[PDB]
Design a binder for this molecule. Structure first.
Ligand SMILES: [Zn+2]
Ligand SMILES: [Zn+2]
Length: 70
């Protein structure tokens, strides 16, 4: 599935991911795109703070969803 991640600058990155992907996995993908270290990445989805060991599906993250780096 496809999701979007908004960096702190409003930049939009596109990610190809799976429902069982962990935030840590996503976090790894963001690092590759922008060079942003995972430990400095904080992801939020629909007002929910996302934990590294949980999956996208665990947060009801669906196709075309948008995540925010904070
Ligand atoms: Zn897909
Ligand atoms: Zn994956």
């Amino acid at each position: 599935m496809q999701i979007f991640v908004k960096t702190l600058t409003g930049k939009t990155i596109t990610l190809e991911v799976e429902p069982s992907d962990t935030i840590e996995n996503v976090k790894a993908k963001i690092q590759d795109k922008e060079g942003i270290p995972p430990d400095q990445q904080r992801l939020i989805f629909a007002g929910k703070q996302l934990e590294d060991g949980r999956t996208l599906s665990d947060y009801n993250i669906q196709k075309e969803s948008t995540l925010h780096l904070v």
